[PDB]
């Protein structure tokens, strides 16, 4: 039953990675969720609804993370000049600096956990799981 | 940056799979967590602490899921005959029946989402990600 084993192993990796990323990001004063909000906003401003949908968390959780990052100086709520109800979450310069530190933590951990795989094996794995992602996102 | 891409894709697959497994398991009156408690107990009784640790959820969440499954007739709390404080969560016959229905739902979804991969590609992916699991669980 290899196909279900792929999926359950994926889940087990995510859970353990989550715990460890939370631990290591904690030194940057971030949770894994906070880091995901920085990753999302690092390439352009995002709506709160997008953040909750894309990363499969509640509206309340996003609100809490955005409020935190806002207090920390890492994101701002930008309001449309005609209708201030239209809000985007925009990363600040400090938010980018902290995001980039987070990426380096993530890279070092990824390098540890994938260390038994050659660069070639890494590439073989990545291209195939990308197809699994495309399909589940279609079904979702 | 392929190694971090493997890990972020793993996370994205887990999130989307979680949402869809919750939806499809809901027809069996189960959450994904409830199903994980059945999977864990299906091969022998488990402590509550084991369930929270193994599946990276809070004690309160396990308590809520076990209490639910207990009301549903799917698990029992078994107490040691000399020290009734020592509790194991044991699956019932009905719990096994419902677990097996859950496994079939999981298999059908796994088959959908991995459908672009040949059996051979499935095997190549599975053996390599098993090594990633071993390492992150060591680090965790």
């Amino acid at each position: 039953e290899n196909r279900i084993q792929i999926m359950s192993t994926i889940a087990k990796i995510y859970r353990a990675m989550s715990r460890e990323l939370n631990r290591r990001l904690g030194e940057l004063n971030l949770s894994y969720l906070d880091f995901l909000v920085l990753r999302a906003t690092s390439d352009g401003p995002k709506t709160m609804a997008y953040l909750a949908n894309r990363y499969f968390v509640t509206q309340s959780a996003i609100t809490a993370s955005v409020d935190k990052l806002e207090e920390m100086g890492l994101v701002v709520r930008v309001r449309d000049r005609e209708d201030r109800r239209k809000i985007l979450i925009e990363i600040t310069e400090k938010g980018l600096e902290t995001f980039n530190k987070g990426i380096e933590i993530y890279k070092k951990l990824a390098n540890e956990v994938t260390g038994d795989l050659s660069e070639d094996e890494v590439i073989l794995v990545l291209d195939k799981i990308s197809k699994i992602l495309k399909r589940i996102e279609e079904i979702s």
Side-chain angles (χ1 to χ4, degrees), chain A:
Chain A
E1 42 218 295
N2 295 331
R3 291 172 186 274
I4 186 175
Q5 212 185 336
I6 286 175
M7 307 316 297
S8 54
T9 300
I10 285 173
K12 292 163 191 175
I13 290 169
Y14 169 79
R15 292 198 282 261
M17 278 294 291
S18 288
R19 175 173 281 155
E20 184 63 12
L21 211 57
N22 271 298
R23 172 188 171 258
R24 296 187 184 193
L25 292 169
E27 300 196 81
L28 299 180
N29 304 292
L30 297 176
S31 67
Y32 182 23
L33 179 62
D34 298 330
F35 177 72
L36 289 177
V37 170
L38 295 176
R39 169 60 187 88
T41 64
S42 62
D43 62 25
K46 305 288 186 289
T47 62
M48 301 285 262
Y50 170 87
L51 297 170
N53 281 309
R54 187 70 186 120
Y55 300 97
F56 300 72
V57 292
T58 59
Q59 187 193 50
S60 290
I62 288 303
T63 290
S65 178
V66 172
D67 280 352
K68 172 184 182 182
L69 292 171
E70 186 186 56
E71 181 66 17
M72 294 175 65
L74 304 190
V75 304
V76 294
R77 292 189 164 81
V78 303
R79 293 163 183 275
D80 181 85
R81 6 88 115 184
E82 280 158 41
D83 182 358
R84 84 178 289 269
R85 306 188 294 179
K86 286 166 183 175
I87 293 156
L88 291 165
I89 307 306
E90 181 184 285
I91 201 167
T92 64
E93 176 191 311
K94 187 62 170 185
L96 283 162
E97 183 194 84
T98 293
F99 165 64
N100 289 325
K101 292 176 182 284
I103 284 291
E104 289 315 299
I105 285 169
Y106 203 168
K107 281 182 184 158
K108 156 179 175 100
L109 178 53
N111 291 348
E112 293 171 40
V113 301
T114 67
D116 304 302
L117 309 179
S118 79
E119 288 300 333
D120 288 341
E121 289 174 315
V122 155
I123 279 171
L124 283 164
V125 164
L126 178 63
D127 297 341
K128 284 161 204 338
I129 67 167
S130 297
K131 299 179 180 196
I132 297 177
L133 183 54
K134 189 182 157 84
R135 286 315 179 192
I136 188 55
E137 280 196 350
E138 281 174 354
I139 291 161
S140 298

